């Protein structure tokens, strides 16, 4: 199909108490349930979550329908974009298995398994893959001896990563441990800042024994490393230029879709080529951009919001 259906959503965290003492202003105005005003500039979105909004409700509005569609055979992608101390990890992971405080990913894992456990004539297979785009290279986060993987396309023109590690999982914890293993292998540097973009893949295969009909859906979880304004003046500079280039290539595709372009330049980067069949078209997408309301951050929460704006129609 040719919908476009990409939604961008912004979640502001509470300034916390320790940031309120160091001396700061809240610098974030809201009007509508979907617009935010910083420095008297309005930024419109599909949805804006303020500090009082629970984890469950960000999951219900960003992810819950994407998961449903994957359990129905479709593809989907979720992006998490944020600068450091924006509330990204809290939003994506949170305190997992506090049922009130877990973020997006753990609720996704439990909604998949509650769906499975809820079914006799239905056979399942969940494959998880986990890799990163670091310095334009695809590294496997589940098998670190595999540092430079390639993208190819099969007979049906759907893209794949030759050699990426696929793990079969059968329980919510077996999924969370695969994720923790990968995280220890991601490129981080300097506070704790992602030097790469990570892609987590949940592939949910189903077979119905009586109708002998099959289903197969791909859910991608992409953690975007924040953009850097960078002038080691060497290996780190390389890291920053690639982060920015691949984000701009991503923006280009996303914006082509949102603006109803009839040529969406997927081929331009490895990440958008990998996610080609899960970005746009009959696939559903949510970009969650996380921002700090804090004044200390106003220069770059402005930059985050501008990035989110690239996805507005």
Author numbering: 4 to 122, 124 to 194, 199 to 239, 243 to 324
Q: What do the authors say?
A:
Whereas kinesin-1 in solution is mostly loaded with ADP, ADP release is accelerated several thousand-fold upon microtubule binding.
We also found that when T92 is mutated to a valine, the nucleotide content of this mutant was very low compared with that of wild-type kinesin. Using these T87A crystals as seeds, we were also able to crystallize wild-type apo-kinesin-1 and the T92V mutant and to determine their structures. Whereas most of the following analysis was performed taking the apo-T87A structure as a reference, identical conclusions could be reached from these wild-type apo-kinesin and T92V isomorphous structures.
